[PDB]
Design an enzyme around this catalytic site. Structure first.
Site, PDB file in Angstrom:
ATOM      1  N   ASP A  12      -6.356   8.398  -0.548  1.00 51.39           N
ATOM      2  CA  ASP A  12      -5.839   7.383   0.376  1.00 51.39           C
ATOM      3  C   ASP A  12      -4.658   8.023   1.143  1.00 51.39           C
ATOM      4  O   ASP A  12      -3.824   8.664   0.518  1.00 51.39           O
ATOM      5  CB  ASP A  12      -5.436   6.084  -0.286  1.00 51.39           C
ATOM      6  CG  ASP A  12      -6.666   5.528  -1.030  1.00 51.39           C
ATOM      7  OD1 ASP A  12      -7.828   5.602  -0.631  1.00 51.39           O
ATOM      8  OD2 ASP A  12      -6.394   4.948  -2.082  1.00 51.39           O
ATOM      9  N   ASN A  65      -7.936   9.439  -5.700  1.00 50.88           N
ATOM     10  CA  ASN A  65      -8.775   8.535  -6.508  1.00 50.88           C
ATOM     11  C   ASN A  65      -9.678   9.314  -7.472  1.00 50.88           C
ATOM     12  O   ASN A  65      -9.915  10.519  -7.305  1.00 50.88           O
ATOM     13  CB  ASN A  65      -9.632   7.620  -5.640  1.00 50.88           C
ATOM     14  CG  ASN A  65      -8.665   6.769  -4.825  1.00 50.88           C
ATOM     15  OD1 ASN A  65      -8.659   6.852  -3.591  1.00 50.88           O
ATOM     16  ND2 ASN A  65      -7.839   6.032  -5.555  1.00 50.88           N
ATOM     17  N   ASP A  77     -12.789   9.066  -7.890  1.00 50.81           N
ATOM     18  CA  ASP A  77     -14.029   9.442  -7.202  1.00 50.81           C
ATOM     19  C   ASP A  77     -13.875  10.690  -6.317  1.00 50.81           C
ATOM     20  O   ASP A  77     -14.875  11.076  -5.683  1.00 50.81           O
ATOM     21  CB  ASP A  77     -14.521   8.242  -6.392  1.00 50.81           C
ATOM     22  CG  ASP A  77     -13.589   7.920  -5.224  1.00 50.81           C
ATOM     23  OD1 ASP A  77     -12.519   8.507  -4.998  1.00 50.81           O
ATOM     24  OD2 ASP A  77     -14.030   6.997  -4.504  1.00 50.81           O
ATOM     25  N   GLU A 121       0.812  -1.226   0.000  1.00 49.22           N
ATOM     26  CA  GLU A 121       0.000   0.000   0.000  1.00 49.22           C
ATOM     27  C   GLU A 121       0.844   1.274   0.000  1.00 49.22           C
ATOM     28  O   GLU A 121       0.533   2.185  -0.806  1.00 49.22           O
ATOM     29  CB  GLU A 121      -0.956   0.087   1.200  1.00 49.22           C
ATOM     30  CG  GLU A 121      -2.187  -0.794   1.308  1.00 49.22           C
ATOM     31  CD  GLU A 121      -3.231  -0.523   0.237  1.00 49.22           C
ATOM     32  OE1 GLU A 121      -3.136   0.375  -0.587  1.00 49.22           O
ATOM     33  OE2 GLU A 121      -4.177  -1.323   0.338  1.00 49.22           O
ATOM     34  N   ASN A 169      -8.856   5.457   3.239  1.00 50.74           N
ATOM     35  CA  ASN A 169      -9.665   6.267   2.327  1.00 50.74           C
ATOM     36  C   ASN A 169     -10.546   7.323   2.963  1.00 50.74           C
ATOM     37  O   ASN A 169     -11.260   7.023   3.937  1.00 50.74           O
ATOM     38  CB  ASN A 169     -10.514   5.268   1.509  1.00 50.74           C
ATOM     39  CG  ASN A 169     -11.200   6.008   0.356  1.00 50.74           C
ATOM     40  OD1 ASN A 169     -12.398   6.358   0.443  1.00 50.74           O
ATOM     41  ND2 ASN A 169     -10.356   6.224  -0.664  1.00 50.74           N
ATOM     42  N   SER A 204     -11.874  10.906  -3.826  1.00 50.58           N
ATOM     43  CA  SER A 204     -11.353  10.510  -2.487  1.00 50.58           C
ATOM     44  C   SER A 204      -9.825  10.400  -2.617  1.00 50.58           C
ATOM     45  O   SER A 204      -9.270  10.390  -3.731  1.00 50.58           O
ATOM     46  CB  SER A 204     -12.029   9.255  -1.983  1.00 50.58           C
ATOM     47  OG  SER A 204     -11.520   8.149  -2.704  1.00 50.58           O
TER      48      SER A 204
HETATM   49  C1  LIG Z   1      -8.686   0.820   3.647  1.00 54.28           C
HETATM   50  C2  LIG Z   1      -9.804   1.671   3.043  1.00 54.28           C
HETATM   51  O1  LIG Z   1      -9.753   2.857   3.435  1.00 54.28           O
HETATM   52  N1  LIG Z   1     -10.518   0.861   2.206  1.00 54.28           N
HETATM   53  C3  LIG Z   1     -11.392   1.098   1.517  1.00 54.28           C
HETATM   54  C4  LIG Z   1     -12.675   0.342   1.867  1.00 54.28           C
HETATM   55  O2  LIG Z   1     -13.184   0.605   3.185  1.00 54.28           O
HETATM   56  C5  LIG Z   1     -13.969   0.788   1.026  1.00 54.28           C
HETATM   57  O3  LIG Z   1     -14.928  -0.302   1.207  1.00 54.28           O
HETATM   58  C6  LIG Z   1     -16.119   0.345   1.516  1.00 54.28           C
HETATM   59  O4  LIG Z   1     -15.979   0.227   2.956  1.00 54.28           O
HETATM   60  C7  LIG Z   1     -17.199   0.527   3.669  1.00 54.28           C
HETATM   61  C8  LIG Z   1     -16.845   0.538   5.096  1.00 54.28           C
HETATM   62  O5  LIG Z   1     -16.635  -0.739   5.657  1.00 54.28           O
HETATM   63  C9  LIG Z   1     -18.270  -0.555   3.355  1.00 54.28           C
HETATM   64  O6  LIG Z   1     -19.532  -0.217   3.957  1.00 54.28           O
HETATM   65  C10 LIG Z   1     -18.462  -0.632   1.782  1.00 54.28           C
HETATM   66  O7  LIG Z   1     -19.341  -1.788   1.619  1.00 54.28           O
HETATM   67  C11 LIG Z   1     -17.149  -0.711   0.992  1.00 54.28           C
HETATM   68  N2  LIG Z   1     -17.140  -1.224   0.089  1.00 54.28           N
HETATM   69  C12 LIG Z   1     -16.663  -2.196  -0.707  1.00 54.28           C
HETATM   70  C13 LIG Z   1     -17.082  -1.589  -2.053  1.00 54.28           C
HETATM   71  O8  LIG Z   1     -16.007  -3.270  -0.679  1.00 54.28           O
HETATM   72  C14 LIG Z   1     -13.585   0.829  -0.453  1.00 54.28           C
HETATM   73  C15 LIG Z   1     -14.593   1.356  -1.396  1.00 54.28           C
HETATM   74  O9  LIG Z   1     -15.185   2.554  -0.922  1.00 54.28           O
HETATM   75  O10 LIG Z   1     -12.479   1.745  -0.603  1.00 54.28           O
HETATM   76  C16 LIG Z   1     -11.227   1.195  -0.051  1.00 54.28           C
HETATM   77  O11 LIG Z   1     -10.321   2.305  -0.043  1.00 54.28           O
END
Ligand SMILES: CC(=O)N[C@@H]1[C@@H](O)[C@H](O[C@@H]2O[C@H](CO)[C@@H](O)[C@H](O)[C@H]2NC(C)=O)[C@@H](CO)O[C@H]1O
Length: 129
Positions: free
Chosen positions: A52, A46, A48, A35, A59, A50
């Site tokens: 990281d 990103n 979108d 990462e 995120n 956002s």
């Molecule tokens: C590490 C990080 O910041 N990861 C990200 C994921 O959290 C994020 O997943 C989204 O997380 C939400 C919180 O748990 C969930 O409700 C949601 O379902 C989810 N989604 C998925 C699509 O797997 C993803 C996407 O927004 O981004 C990663 O950066």
């Protein structure tokens, strides 16, 4: 700060990450490596809108507030800037909150990609932890 692999392993181990929500230490060293290359100051914007942040690349859409992310939720209740310090305390506390969601450690794309189902012995070899 750019952490040394074993230096990072010791700080994670000292902070209770070894086995946190059933995720052994090597899991956490592997995803940090892929990462951010162990750099606490790493940032990646990103598509979108956002971004990281930090060693764990957390995120801004769901976990922290960076003030420029549309539809942000700030579940860790912090400024994303706090995720960039040499001191890992706030980052660790927020990564601990992230892994409690249903998706667990699969929240991290780099873990899904390079670490899942892999032999992670090498990430802590020689750290003496
Ligand atoms: C590490 C990080 O910041 N990861 C990200 C994921 O959290 C994020 O997943 C989204 O997380 C939400 C919180 O748990 C969930 O409700 C949601 O379902 C989810 N989604 C998925 C699509 O797997 C993803 C996407 O927004 O981004 C990663 O950066």
């Amino acid at each position: 700060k750019v952490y040394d692999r074993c230096e990072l392993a010791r700080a994670l181990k000292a902070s209770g990450m070894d086995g946190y929500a059933g995720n052994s230490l090597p899991n956490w060293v592997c995803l940090s490596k892929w990462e951010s290359s162990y750099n606490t100051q790493a940032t990646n914007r990103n598509t979108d809108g956002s971004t990281d942040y930090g060693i764990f690349q957390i995120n801004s859409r769901y976990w922290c507030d960076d003030g420029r992310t549309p539809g942000a939720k700030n579940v860790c209740g912090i400024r994303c800037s706090q995720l960039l310090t040499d001191d890992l305390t706030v980052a660790i506390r927020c990564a601990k909150r992230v892994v409690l969601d249903p998706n667990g450690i699969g929240a991290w794309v780099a873990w899904r990609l390079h670490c899942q189902n892999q032999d992670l012995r090498s990430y802590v070899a020689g750290c003496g932890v």
